[PDB]
Amino acid sequence: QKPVCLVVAMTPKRGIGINNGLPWPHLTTDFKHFSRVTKTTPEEASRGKRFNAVVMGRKTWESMPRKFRPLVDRLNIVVSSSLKEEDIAAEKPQAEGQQRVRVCASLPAALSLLEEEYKDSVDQIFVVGGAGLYEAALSLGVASHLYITRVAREFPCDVFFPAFPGDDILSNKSTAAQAAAPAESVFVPFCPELGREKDNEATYRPIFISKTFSDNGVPYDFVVLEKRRKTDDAAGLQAPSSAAAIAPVLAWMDEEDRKKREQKELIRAVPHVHFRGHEEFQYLDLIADIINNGRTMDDRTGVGVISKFGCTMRYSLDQAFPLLTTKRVFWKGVLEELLWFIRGDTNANHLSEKGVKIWDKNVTREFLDSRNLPHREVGDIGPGYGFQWRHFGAAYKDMHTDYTGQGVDQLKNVIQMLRTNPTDRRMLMTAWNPAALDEMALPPCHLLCQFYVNDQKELSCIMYQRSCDVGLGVPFNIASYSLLTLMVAHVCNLKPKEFIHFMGNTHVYTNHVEALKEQLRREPRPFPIVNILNKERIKEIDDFTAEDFEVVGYVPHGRIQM
Amino acid sequence: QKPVCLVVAMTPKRGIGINNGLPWPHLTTDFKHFSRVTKTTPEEASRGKRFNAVVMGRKTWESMPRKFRPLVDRLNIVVSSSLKEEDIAAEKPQAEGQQRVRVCASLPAALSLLEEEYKDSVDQIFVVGGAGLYEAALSLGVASHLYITRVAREFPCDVFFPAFPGDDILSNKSTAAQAAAPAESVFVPFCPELGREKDNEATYRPIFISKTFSDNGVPYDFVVLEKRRKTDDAQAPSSAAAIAPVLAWMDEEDRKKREQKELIRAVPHVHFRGHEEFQYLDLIADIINNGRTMDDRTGVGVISKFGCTMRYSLDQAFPLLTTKRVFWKGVLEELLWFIRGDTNANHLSEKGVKIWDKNVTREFLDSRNLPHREVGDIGPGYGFQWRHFGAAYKDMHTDYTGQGVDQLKNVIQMLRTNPTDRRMLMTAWNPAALDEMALPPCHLLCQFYVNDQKELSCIMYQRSCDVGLGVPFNIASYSLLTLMVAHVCNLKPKEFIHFMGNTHVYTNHVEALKEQLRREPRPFPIVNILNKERIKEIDDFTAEDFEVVGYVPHGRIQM
Numbered sequence A: 001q002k003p004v005c006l007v008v009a010m011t012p013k014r015g016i017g018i019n020n021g022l023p024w025p026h027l028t029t030d031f032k033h034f035s036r037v038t039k040t041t042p043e044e045a046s047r048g049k050r051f052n053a054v055v056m057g058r059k060t061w062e063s064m065p066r067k068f069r070p071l072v073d074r075l076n077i078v079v080s081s082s083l084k085e086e087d088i089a090a091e092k093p094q095a096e097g098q099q100r101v102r103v104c105a106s107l108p109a110a111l112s113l114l115e116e117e118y119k120d121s122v123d124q125i126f127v128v129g130g131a132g133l134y135e136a137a138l139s140l141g142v143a144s145h146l147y148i149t150r151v152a153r154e155f156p157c158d159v160f161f162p163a164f165p166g167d168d169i170l171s172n173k174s175t176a177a178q179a180a181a182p183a184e185s186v187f188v189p190f191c192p193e194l195g196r197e198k199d200n201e202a203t204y205r206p207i208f209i210s211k212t213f214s215d216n217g218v219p220y221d222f223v224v225l226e227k228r229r230k231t232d233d234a235a236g237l238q239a240p241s242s243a244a245a246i247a248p249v250l251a252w253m254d255e256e257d258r259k260k261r262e263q264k265e266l267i268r269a270v271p272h273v274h275f276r277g278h279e280e281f282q283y284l285d286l287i288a289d290i291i292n293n294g295r296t297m298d299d300r301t302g303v304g305v306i307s308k309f310g311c312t313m314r315y316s317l318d319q320a321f322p323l324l325t326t327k328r329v330f331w332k333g334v335l336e337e338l339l340w341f342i343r344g345d346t347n348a349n350h351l352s353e354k355g356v357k358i359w360d361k362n363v364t365r366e367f368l369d370s371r372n373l374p375h376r377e378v379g380d381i382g383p384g385y386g387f388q389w390r391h392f393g394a395a396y397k398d399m400h401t402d403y404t405g406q407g408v409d410q411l412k413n414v415i416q417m418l419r420t421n422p423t424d425r426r427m428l429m430t431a432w433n434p435a436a437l438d439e440m441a442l443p444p445c446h447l448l449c450q451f452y453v454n455d456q457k458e459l460s461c462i463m464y465q466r467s468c469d470v471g472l473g474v475p476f477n478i479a480s481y482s483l484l485t486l487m488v489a490h491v492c493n494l495k496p497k498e499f500i501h502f503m504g505n506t507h508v509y510t511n512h513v514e515a516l517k518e519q520l521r522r523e524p525r526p527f528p529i530v531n532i533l534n535k536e537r538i539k540e541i542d543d544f545t546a547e548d549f550e551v552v553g554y555v556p557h558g559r560i561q562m
Numbered sequence B: 001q002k003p004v005c006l007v008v009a010m011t012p013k014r015g016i017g018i019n020n021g022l023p024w025p026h027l028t029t030d031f032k033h034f035s036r037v038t039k040t041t042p043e044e045a046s047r048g049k050r051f052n053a054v055v056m057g058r059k060t061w062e063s064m065p066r067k068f069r070p071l072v073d074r075l076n077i078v079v080s081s082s083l084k085e086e087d088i089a090a091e092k093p094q095a096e097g098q099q100r101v102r103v104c105a106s107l108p109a110a111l112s113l114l115e116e117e118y119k120d121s122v123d124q125i126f127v128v129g130g131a132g133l134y135e136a137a138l139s140l141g142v143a144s145h146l147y148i149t150r151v152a153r154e155f156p157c158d159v160f161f162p163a164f165p166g167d168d169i170l171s172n173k174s175t176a177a178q179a180a181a182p183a184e185s186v187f188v189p190f191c192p193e194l195g196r197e198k199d200n201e202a203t204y205r206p207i208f209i210s211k212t213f214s215d216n217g218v219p220y221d222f223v224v225l226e227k228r229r230k231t232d233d234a235q236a237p238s239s240a241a242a243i244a245p246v247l248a249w250m251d252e253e254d255r256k257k258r259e260q261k262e263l264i265r266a267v268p269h270v271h272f273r274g275h276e277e278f279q280y281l282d283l284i285a286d287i288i289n290n291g292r293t294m295d296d297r298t299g300v301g302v303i304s305k306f307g308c309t310m311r312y313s314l315d316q317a318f319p320l321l322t323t324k325r326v327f328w329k330g331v332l333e334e335l336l337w338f339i340r341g342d343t344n345a346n347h348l349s350e351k352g353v354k355i356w357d358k359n360v361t362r363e364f365l366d367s368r369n370l371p372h373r374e375v376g377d378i379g380p381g382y383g384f385q386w387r388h389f390g391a392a393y394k395d396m397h398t399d400y401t402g403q404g405v406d407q408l409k410n411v412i413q414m415l416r417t418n419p420t421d422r423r424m425l426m427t428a429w430n431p432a433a434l435d436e437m438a439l440p441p442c443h444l445l446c447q448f449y450v451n452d453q454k455e456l457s458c459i460m461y462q463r464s465c466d467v468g469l470g471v472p473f474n475i476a477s478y479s480l481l482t483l484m485v486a487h488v489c490n491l492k493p494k495e496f497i498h499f500m501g502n503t504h505v506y507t508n509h510v511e512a513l514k515e516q517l518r519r520e521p522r523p524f525p526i527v528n529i530l531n532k533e534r535i536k537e538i539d540d541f542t543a544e545d546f547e548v549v550g551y552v553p554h555g556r557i558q559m
């Protein structure tokens, strides 16, 4: 008996087509992935002809160009009550060693024909569409795995993939214990013989989430969901002698560490995903790692943290934007705060006036007084972050003072050094000015950043942060400095490659631990795409406006349950 | 047939004993390690009573204090011509479940008794010493593995482990390099059946090198050597299967590049690579395999990655790297020179620390449009910024007391009073001072951290890392700085974290580095602070308040 799997791409609302075509621009990587999955004999996965089978509906077959159909190097089966096997044979001259397309009257007919006639010849069976066969395959229960290309943008659609148990991996289920009726979806039988019995209910669990890809302005990733029971109870290698000699020394060296692992319940972000390729697993694993292995300490605010020292993460910028999906990020704040920085502004009331209240609780007359700055007007963060970037070291009077040409303009120097001499190893910008710390409302958190260019005009950025609030700050800081890297790269004719986050005191507050364990049950969605708008207008880092971006296809999980 | 292994601890001169006792103070982890290894049955390592045998010569039996004798929970066999099984039994009669201590006329005798009379009970046979039994074991050829605790210091000894093919893992090999070995080294048969034939020659090769431990002021590490022939020298099935064709095409690119690159790898035979120097060795390899070649300011040609890290433990041993000697002197004097606020490179050079000299020469300062710098004047660089951040620089003779931000004083004061602060930083990266400086700083920031156990940790961030030449020194500098700060804050040093920006090797050093990568690392030395009672503030340290105990690095590269 032969494996059956579903291969599909769908928008977050399960859209799969419109007017008998695909709803989106051509996803190149997806087409390559589709071919590599459907053409791969199972022997070659881990490094007398045997081939795979793709089964499609009539319309799906009719949606293809004659030159592409039948799909090369795979036995094509078409479920149609009207298509004739001989018409299809007559469409084009038959290639050598290509199978003869078959036409069957139902999915059960096709699977049967493959099992009996093609027993020695076919290895794997793929259902490649459309919604008819998808529903057929899901209700029949035959699909062990679903290869789902998650397309992060919505498009107009007339054809949708059936709702199914496991489809919350696509977007937020408003049935967060607040359902109207039980969420409607095909019944997936776990044991296909045993039909729609109450005990025989299956769900699809993700085992595999890739990093985000993109083509033609469409971000997407690949997941593999595996049929499990809907149990809902929660509701290197070496020689055998080389390994056995080492083992007693690895055994006692790990005694102190094995003991503490069984004394506590190791946290783990969505443990069932074996291949954790989505880049957000760095963030989720860091959260787990601080709860698991950090040390509970006291801190400035009184709340109390668990902390690690010296942690890192890297995010790709060549295909999507690392705007974290397991809890929505205040994008408007990231953008207005960063444009503010670039301006050299220290007046937080310019932010507070735009809805970005993040600096407010630190520019109060009370707090400015707690810092022995009774001379500071409310909203005057002092000579802080963006002051230090555009005027390092300059004397500070107040936020209304114009500071043009005072101090060192590191951002101008980084951009100039990248335009002219990108192999330089001194392209730094710091806000950590210790002669200025006491003039500041807040000593800067993200305090250093460095730029690099490889042999292919690809720009990377490191940023060092002494204090990282993983629960609330880190995702903002990741977006803040990723966005900076997009902006710098654009005004420098570089392509953006990677943001690297270097972290000092890295902590979670003990009042967030319970909510963060909740977050760690969330599987990340594909990353969005951040597009610079009006690129031809924007020639210098100061030309960017808050209206010059667009966060396309951002599909984050919602609010925490606590 | 039952596996035979050797367990031993030895100084780099192969010394194992003096006056029929151990040559060193008590090594607790070695004791822990020896007991876990000789007592672990393979049931509990790969995760009717079954026990291993330890086999020892007569004097090793007599060297054990009677409280430890016989070794508990293991069959004890003593190879002796005088000792009698009777007498041994009458010395401390055996507990229930312990084994009668056996006595045998020879290691062949002992090993037959184990294979014939303990064929159902004995799992592993360990030969535990001393010199007489070790030599027999090596020459018989029965030992598949050697478990050697490499004690990093030499202590006086009157008994030594036999010279053996593979003893290069202990120290350098010049004074008796290769032609002294046939007369000194035991011949180790590969197949013990075929004995001492020309094509039956074996060697012992490192498969396992642990991180460096210490006790009672003795640094040491654990290795396992395997017998090899001398002639090699000059999730669920459905889950995994479902996933695999997807990994197959995502790995398409990186497999095809991999199969073209012939991959540098440090000492690839070592499978467990616990020694912390492997991060450095690996990093060098990662850069040569995967970095990008461009040229640089001088046109020399550099291979670079961007954003690398390493971490080193300061609690048992000091990361003075062993695959190439580190200029400890320069590390210690430059760091004190930093702590002084001193910017006069001549004060180092007159101490034989010549590292700054090429960057303070009249010609070089002129290349920085600093024709007004007196020769030796690094400008308001590293130490000036640590102790006078933002101060206005005159020259290296000026007394800047009370000017600028004394970052180092604030760090210590914060560690002594509010150690859970998260602003305890110190930077030399002053962009307003950069042009006043001979060299824009390399290690430009460092941050400190205390856990709940009085343990200090330091992160240093470095924009530009010459992995070949600069980096091991930089590791030493900031690790030693963490020892000094820890001591004057009544803290214990835990860890030095190295955050690297542009990280590179020059293309001319690549051939020499392939050679260096052929060397197994040695155990780290201990660095000690003497006169701790006399040292109360970070300025009180002097060059004489330090000692480096146990540093046995490889010698110079031929390439």
Ligand SMILES: NC(=O)C1=CN([C@@H]2O[C@H](COP(=O)(O)OP(=O)(O)OC[C@H]3O[C@@H](n4cnc5c(N)ncnc54)[C@H](OP(=O)(O)O)[C@@H]3O)[C@@H](O)[C@H]2O)C=CC1
Pocket (backbone or CB within 6 Å): A007, A008, A009, A010, A016, A017, A018, A019, A020, A021, A022, A056, A057, A058, A059, A060, A061, A063, A079, A080, A081, A082, A083, A105, A106, A107, A128, A129, A130, A131, A132, A133, A136, A159
């Ligand atoms: N994004 C993706 O991954 C994919 C997208 N698509 C898109 O989806 C749409 C096509 O899906 P759809 O519109 O549902 O048409 P289908 O591809 O499902 O083919 C529909 C026809 O196939 C036959 N058929 C389908 N289901 C059954 C069944 N259960 N039993 C018997 N015969 C069956 C019938 O042919 P007859 O009436 O002749 O009996 C039916 O009218 C197109 O827009 C296409 O582009 C298609 C495939 C994959």
Ligand SMILES: NC(=O)C1=CN([C@@H]2O[C@H](COP(=O)(O)OP(=O)(O)OC[C@H]3O[C@@H](n4cnc5c(N)ncnc54)[C@H](OP(=O)(O)O)[C@@H]3O)[C@@H](O)[C@H]2O)C=CC1
Pocket (backbone or CB within 6 Å): B007, B008, B009, B010, B015, B016, B017, B018, B019, B020, B021, B022, B056, B057, B058, B059, B060, B061, B063, B079, B080, B081, B082, B083, B105, B106, B107, B128, B129, B130, B131, B132, B133, B136, B159
């Ligand atoms: N650092 C370490 O790991 C270890 C260190 N040591 C140190 O080593 C020293 C003891 O070793 P050593 O001094 O060599 O004495 P041994 O422990 O080697 O035993 C020597 C005696 O054992 C018997 N013997 C040894 N080899 C043979 C043989 N091939 N055939 C038959 N009988 C044999 C003889 O006993 P008889 O004369 O009765 O026949 C010989 O006199 C001590 O200083 C001890 O502390 C010991 C063990 C391990």
Ligand SMILES: Nc1nc(N)c(-c2cccc(Cl)c2)c(CCOCCCOc2ccccc2)n1
Pocket (backbone or CB within 6 Å): A007, A008, A009, A030, A031, A034, A035, A056, A060, A063, A064, A065, A068, A127, A128, A129, A147, A148, A149
């Ligand atoms: N992840 C994924 N799953 C899928 N089921 C398809 C798919 C979509 C429409 C028709 C068919 Cl047969 C397959 C794709 C899109 C890539 O399909 C490549 C094979 C089909 O090739 C063509 C070529 C032209 C028009 C329609 C399909 N990606």
Ligand SMILES: Nc1nc(N)c(-c2cccc(Cl)c2)c(CCOCCCOc2ccccc2)n1
Pocket (backbone or CB within 6 Å): B007, B008, B009, B030, B031, B034, B035, B056, B060, B063, B064, B065, B068, B071, B127, B128, B129, B147, B148, B149
């Ligand atoms: N890596 C290693 N290898 C070894 N062969 C020994 C060893 C040394 C002397 C005698 C014996 Cl039987 C074993 C040790 C030292 C720890 O051995 C613990 C067992 C013997 O316990 C004592 C205690 C005090 C003096 C002598 C042996 N470490």
Ligand SMILES: O=c1ccn([C@H]2C[C@H](O)[C@@H](COP(=O)(O)O)O2)c(=O)[nH]1
Pocket (backbone or CB within 6 Å): A300, A301, A443, A445, A446, A467, A468, A469, A470, A472, A473, A474, A477, B422, B423
């Ligand atoms: O950009 C920022 C700014 C602040 N924080 C968090 C980290 C700490 O929880 C707190 C900073 O306070 P101190 O590090 O000064 O104690 O705010 C961030 O994560 N990112």
Ligand SMILES: O=c1ccn([C@H]2C[C@H](O)[C@@H](COP(=O)(O)O)O2)c(=O)[nH]1
Pocket (backbone or CB within 6 Å): A425, A426, B297, B442, B443, B463, B464, B465, B466, B467, B469, B470, B471, B474
């Ligand atoms: O403390 C130091 C000082 C210098 N370098 C090396 C790294 C670079 O190869 C070179 C510095 O040159 P630039 O970073 O200025 O280009 O010296 C170090 O590794 N550590």
